[PDB]
């Protein structure tokens, strides 16, 4: 499915996302999954409060993701 | 010596049993049948809410999603 391949293609770029938690995470993406796991670095979190933090490495569960936000050049990518 | 969930519910059938839900409520009553999903069935059941009887209903089935507990009275 294409909604997963687009994700894999944004590996390397910087990504924003939203979780069921309520907070949004921003950082370079290293690995993804068909599950929608993620592996990121130099993350800059921002919760409901506005509280910023730093997280060196992170793993996620897709189930916990609401939605992603992806770079702009990833709209000319091929959809097979 | 191991006691597994199917064998446990295959031996629990008939006797008095109390089972909770995810929302606090706990119902007592004897057990008639058990599906492969657990998915309980009860007869002559009295609903104990916060350790207090509310309404005697009788014949019952509970969807297997809400079941938190299974044990005995």
């Amino acid at each position: 499915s294409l909604c997963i391949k687009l994700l894999h293609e944004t590996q390397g770029h910087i990504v924003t996302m939203e979780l069921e938690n309520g907070s949004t995470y921003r950082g370079k993406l290293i690995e993804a999954e068909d599950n929608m796991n993620c592996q990121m670095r130099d993350i800059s979190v921002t919760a409901r409060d506005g509280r910023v933090s730093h997280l060196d490495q992170v793993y996620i569960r897709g189930s916990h993701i609401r939605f992603l936000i992806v770079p702009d050049m990833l709209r000319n990518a091929p959809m097979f | 010596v191991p006691v597994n969930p199917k064998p446990f519910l295959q031996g629990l059938i008939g006797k008095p049993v109390l089972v909770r839900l995810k929302w606090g409520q706990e119902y007592k009553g004897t057990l008639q049948s058990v599906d492969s999903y657990m998915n309980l069935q009860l007869l002559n059941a009295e609903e104990l809410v916060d350790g207090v009887k509310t309404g005697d209903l009788g014949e019952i089935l509970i969807r297997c999603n809400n079941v938190l507990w299974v044990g005995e009275v």
């Binding site: - | 839900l21 008639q32 049948s33 058990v34 599906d35 492969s36 998915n39 309980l40 069935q41 209903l57 009788g58 014949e59 019952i60 089935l61 509970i62 969807r63 999603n65 809400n66």
Partner: protein, 87 residues
């Protein structure tokens, strides 16, 4: 294969028993709004087609009732079924 086996013996048999007996049923829902009616047909997920339904639900305490002719209920919303006979 094994689905045929459980409909006769298991928990779900008492609806098949009741619905064939032309029986009424009390259903406790996940919406906190109980359903009182007579059933037409059911399924393995507890997807039930109800007829002549009447709800009972508190407010801010005020109880309110409404009659509905035909109603397909998705089994997810159901949490507890009470299969009460007239006899």
């Amino acid at each position: 294969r094994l689905e045929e086996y459980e409909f006769s013996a298991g928990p779900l048999s008492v609806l098949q028993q009741a619905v064939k007996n032309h029986d009424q049923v009390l259903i406790n829902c996940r919406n906190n709004k109980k359903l009182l009616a007579r059933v037409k047909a059911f399924d393995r997920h507890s997807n039930m087609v109800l007829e002549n339904v009447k709800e009972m639900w508190t407010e801010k305490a005020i109880n309110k009732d409404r009659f509905i002719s035909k109603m397909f209920l998705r089994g997810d919303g159901v949490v507890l079924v009470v299969r009460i006979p007239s006899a």
